Design a protein around this ligand. Structure first.
Ligand SMILES: *[C@@H]1O[C@H](CO)[C@@H](O)[C@H](O)[C@H]1NC(C)=O
Lengths: 48, 49
């Protein structure tokens, strides 16, 4: 089972993580049934 | 294929459904039915397992 929990939080701090409490709601459970040992973030370029 | 053929030569559309169980979580389930909810009585309830 692949559990994805998520939370959206409105913050106004400039640099670091804000200090506070926010419990993450369960968003979606995925029936994947596969081995995962590595991950990589996906970003977006800005072209001009 | 022609429409005037015998029953042993007429075209037959065949669909073969193959059901396998793998170690991944099984997700193609049948439609479980829903017995009409009864309130205010001592009943045996089964809600989502
Ligand atoms: C999952 O992948 C890792 C790294 O490839 C491997 O060491 C491990 O044995 C794998 N586990 C299964 C159950 O395939």
């Amino acid at each position: 089972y692949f559990k994805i929990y998520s939370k959206h939080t409105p913050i106004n701090l400039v640099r670091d993580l804000p200090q506070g409490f926010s419990a993450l709601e369960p968003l979606v459970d995925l029936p994947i049934g596969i081995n995962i040992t590595r991950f990589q973030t996906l970003l977006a370029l800005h072209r001009s | 294929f022609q429409p005037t053929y015998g029953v042993g030569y007429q075209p037959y559309r065949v669909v073969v459904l193959s059901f396998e169980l793998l170690h991944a979580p099984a997700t193609v389930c049948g439609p479980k039915k829903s017995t009409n909810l009864v309130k205010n009585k001592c009943v045996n309830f089964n809600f989502n397992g």
